[PDB]
């Protein structure tokens, strides 16, 4: 109604968000998020949502510099329009630190980078285990 979420997550818009510190590869993180109702690694569909997600993670801590979000490229470079959100939302907002199309052999998953105050996206090796943010409904 006035948007409430489960203990352990935060509301924004019509969604609940939760940061998990025990690191997982991109695929394992998204699968973990899917345990939740309409859950998936967070999709960032507006600058406003980007700022909110940023505030959610800013206090993670020195040990972590990258956090998984739900953007990946199933074409593994062969496409650079192969990127998509695991939630299947239309890619209507773009916040790359450096566009992957300017990178030779970029990572095929995207993470929020501490260098950009977690407001921008960095191509990253999908197999690396990182903390991650889930976006779901309650």
Annotated binding site for Zn(2+): 15, 72, 84, 108
Q: How far is the CB of 77 from Zn ion (least distance, A)?
A: 5
**Contact status: 13 vs Zn ion (CB under 5 A):** no
- HSE-up of 20 (CA within 13 Å, CB side)? 22
By the rule CB under 5 A, 80 interacts with Zn ion? no
Determine the straight-line distance between the first and last CA of the chain, rounded to whole angstroms.
10
List 38, 46, 92, 115, residue binding Zn ion (CB under 5 A):
38
How many residues of this chain interact with Zn ion, rule: CB under 5 A? 4
Binding site for Zn ion (CB under 5 A): 38, 74, 77, 84
């Amino acid at each position: 109604a006035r948007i409430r979420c489960p203990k352990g997550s935060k509301a924004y818009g019509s969604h609940c968000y939760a940061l998990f510190l025990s690191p997982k590869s991109w695929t394992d993180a998204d699968l973990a998020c899917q345990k939740r109702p309409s859950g998936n690694l967070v999709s960032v569909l507006s600058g406003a949502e980007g700022s909110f997600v940023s505030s959610l993670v800013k206090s993670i801590g020195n040990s972590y510099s990258y956090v998984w979000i739900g953007l990946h490229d199933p074409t593994q470079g062969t496409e650079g329009e192969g990127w998509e959100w695991s939630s299947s939302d239309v890619m209507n907002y773009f916040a790359w630190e450096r566009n992957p199309s300017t990178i030779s052999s970029p990572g095929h998953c995207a993470s929020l980078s501490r260098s950009t105050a977690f407001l921008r996206w960095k191509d990253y090796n999908c197999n690396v285990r990182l903390p991650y943010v889930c976006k779901f409904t309650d």
